[PDB]
Design a protein around this ligand. Structure first.
Ligand code: FAD
Ligand code: CL
Length: 485
C-alpha cells in the first residue's frame, strides 16, 4: 500500500502545498509530521517568534482535523526520528518542501540517504520561493545576478512563475490507528510555557495559515492601494494600521504562499494599467525576496563577513558598550529607542524603521559590525529569514549591494518628517508621553521646568544621547571612504 509522510519545516500551509498533494495521491495513510527540537532553548530565540511558530502549528492542527486527519509534532532530531517511523508506519514515500538554506541542505542530504536505505521515495517540490532559484542561475549563464536591475530583467525573460497548486481534498487519509510513535500525548502541539519560556509573548500578530489568508484579503480590499504601491514612499511611523502588508512573518514560516501573492497581484495589475513597476511595487518586494534568496544560496559564507566574496572587508569596531545601549533601547535618541522597543515587543518594524537602527549602529554613528546587529534581529524578528536578514544588513552597512555611505539618516530628523507629534514615540516609549512635540525627538534640548512638568528628566528617567550625531557621522563617513579605496 502507499503510506506517505508530508514533512513540515517551512510551508506551514494547506493551500499551494504541492507536496501535500503528492503525499495524498493514491495514499492509504498520510502522516503529517513536524519535527520539534525538545531542547534548543537550552543551547537566541524570543518567545514572540517561537509562539508564532506554535500558533502556526495549531492552525495546521485544526485544519487537518476538519479533514479527518491529525498533525503529529514529533520530538527529537530528524536523523534519529525518521528511521524509526519509516519502518513503524510502513512508509513508501516522503514529501517535503525544498529549502535552499545551508543547514537545510545538510539536514536534507542526511534524511534522503536514510530514506534510500528504507526503500522510501523522496519527492521535494519547489514552493517556498517563486521560481526554481537554480534555473534562474542556469539561464543566466551559471552565475547569479548581483543587481536588482539585472535580476528583474532575468525573471521577465523566464516569464510568469508557476501557478499556485490546487487545494487538497476535503477528506485526507488519516494516520494508522494504534501506532506507538503517533500517540496524542506525545505528538501534541506544546505551549510556550511547556517548551521552557517563563515570559509571555507581547506581539500583536498571530500565527497560522488562517490569519495569513485573512490579512491577505484585507490588503486586497483596496486594489487602488495595491496597484499604486510604492515602498520608499510609505510611513515608518504608522503603527495602528501599518503602511505595508506585514506579511513577512507568514511568508517566512510558509503560512502564506508566494505563488498565491504573485497571482493575486497580477489580477489587480491587469485591471490597473498604471500600476507601479519594480522595484518599488508590491511585486518588486517579492522580487527582492527572490533576489536575495538566489544570490545567498550560491554565495559562500553569505551570513558572515569573513569568507564572503560579495561582502566588503570593513574594520568594524568592537564596542560592547555601544551595542548594549543600542539593543537595550537606551541610546538617548527617542526615535531609535522606540524602534528597538517595537523590536522586542512586536517583533516587526517598518522597512524604513529598520533602516534607522541598522544605519545608526553601523556605518552611521556607532561603527559596530552589522553581524552584531543581525544577531539581535535574528532573536526578536518574527519574520527572521536567513538570506533576507543577511543581505539587508549588508545593504545597510554599505558592505554589499549599497555603496552610498554619504547617505546617513539623522536619528532625530528622519522620523520628524512623518510624525512631528511623536505618536509612535509616545506609544512605545510612554516615559515621554507628556513631553511637548518641540523636544520629543530631542529631550536633552528641553528646558528642565519642561522636563519635570512632563516627568522625563534627561539622565534620571530617560538617558542622554550616547553620541553626538554630527560628530559620530563625520567620523564614520571618513573611514568608509578610506575602505572603498
Ligand atoms: C536590516 C534589515 C533586516 C531585515 N530582515 C528581514 C528579515 O529577517 N525577514 C524579512 O522578511 N525581511 C527582512 N527585511 C526586509 C523588510 O524590512 C521586510 O521584509 C519588511 O519590513 C516586511 O514588511 P511587509 O511584510 O509589510 O512587506 P511589504 O513591503 O508588504 O512586502 C511584501 C513582502 O515582500 C518581501 N520584502 C519586502 N521588502 C523586502 C526586502 N527589503 N528584502 C526582501 N524581501 C522583502 C517580504 O517577503 C514581504 O513580506 C529586513 C530589512 C532590513 C533593512
Ligand atoms: Cl535623514
Amino acid at each position: 500500500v502507499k503510506n506517505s509522510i508530508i514533512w513540515f519545516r517551512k510551508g506551514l500551509r494547506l493551500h499551494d502545498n504541492p507536496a501535500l498533494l503528492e503525499a495524498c495521491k493514491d495514499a492509504k495513510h498520510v502522516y503529517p509530521v513536524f519535527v520539534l527540537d525538545p531542547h534548543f532553548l537550552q543551547q537566541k530565540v524570543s518567545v514572540n517568534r517561537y509562539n508564532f511558530l506554535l500558533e502556526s502549528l495549531e492552525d495546521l492542527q485544526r485544519s487537518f482535523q476538519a479533514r479527518g486527519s491529525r498533525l503529529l509534532v514529533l520530538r527529537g532530531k530528524p536523523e534519529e526520528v525518521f528511521p524509526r517511523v519509516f519502518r513503524e508506519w510502513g512508509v513508501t514515500q516522503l514529501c517535503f518542501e525544498h529549502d535552499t538554506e545551508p543547514y537545510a541542505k545538510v539536514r536534507d542530504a542526511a534524511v534522503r540517504r536514510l530514506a534510500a536505505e528504507a526503500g522510501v521515495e523522496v519527492v521535494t517540490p519547489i514552493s517556498h520561493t517563486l521560481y526554481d532559484t537554480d534555473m534562474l542561475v542556469a539561464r543566466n549563464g551559471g552565475a547569479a545576478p548581483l543587481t536588482m536591475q539585472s535580476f528583474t530583467k532575468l525573471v521577465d525573460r523566464v516569464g510568469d512563475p508557476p501557478a499556485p497548486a490546487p487545494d487538497p481534498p476535503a477528506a485526507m487519509p488519516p494516520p494508522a490507528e494504534d501506532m506507538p510513535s503517533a500517540a496524542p500525548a506525545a505528538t501534541g502541539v506544546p505551549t510556550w510555557q511547556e517548551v521552557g519560556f517563563k515570559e509571555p509573548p507581547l506581539t500583536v500578530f498571530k500565527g497560522g495559515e488562517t490569519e495569513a489568508l485573512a490579512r491577505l484579503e484585507a490588503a486586497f480590499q483596496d486594489p487602488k492601494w495595491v496597484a499604486g504601491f510604492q515602498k520608499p514612499d510609505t510611513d515608518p511611523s504608522a503603527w495602528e494600521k501599518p503602511a505595508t502588508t506585514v506579511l513577512s512573518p507568514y511568508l517566512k514560516f510558509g503560512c502564506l504562499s508566494a505563488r498565491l501573492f504573485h497571482a493575486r497581484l497580477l489580477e489587480v495589475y491587469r485591471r490597473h494599467p498604471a500600476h507601479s513597476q519594480p522595484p518599488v511595487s508590491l511585486r518588486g518586494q517579492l522580487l527582492w525576496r527572490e533576489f536575495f534568496y538566489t544570490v545567498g544560496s550560491t554565495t559562500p559564507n553569505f551570513h558572515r563577513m569573513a569568507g564572503n566574496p560579495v561582502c566588503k572587508q570593513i574594520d568594524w569596531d568592537d564596542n560592547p558598550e555601544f551595542l548594549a545601549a543600542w539593543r537595550e533601547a537606551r541610546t538617548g535618541f527617542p526615535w531609535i529607542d522606540a524602534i528597538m522597543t517595537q523590536l522586542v515587543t512586536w517583533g516587526w518594524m517598518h522597512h524604513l524603521a529598520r533602516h534607522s537602527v541598522a544605519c545608526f549602529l553601523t556605518r552611521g554613528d556607532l561603527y559596530v559590525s552589522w553581524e552584531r546587529g543581525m544577531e539581535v534581529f535574528e532573536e526578536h524578528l518574527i519574520d527572521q529569514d536567513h538570506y533576507l536578514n543577511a543581505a539587508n544588513w549588508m545593504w545597510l552597512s554599505a558592505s554589499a549591494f549599497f555603496s552610498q555611505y554619504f547617505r546617513v539618516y539623522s536619528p532625530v530628523v528622519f522620523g520628524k518628517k512623518y510624525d512631528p507629534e511623536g505618536r509612535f514615540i509616545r506609544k512605545f516609549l510612554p516615559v515621554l508621553k507628556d513631553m511637548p512635540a518641540k523636544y520629543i525627538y530631542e529631550p536633552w534640548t528641553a528646558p528642565l521646568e519642561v522636563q519635570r512638568k512632563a516627568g522625563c528628566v534627561v539622565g534620571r528617567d530617560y538617558p542622554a544621547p550616547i553620541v553626538d550625531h554630527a560628530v559620530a557621522s563625520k567620523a564614520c563617513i571618513a573611514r568608509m571612504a578610506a575602505a572603498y579605496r
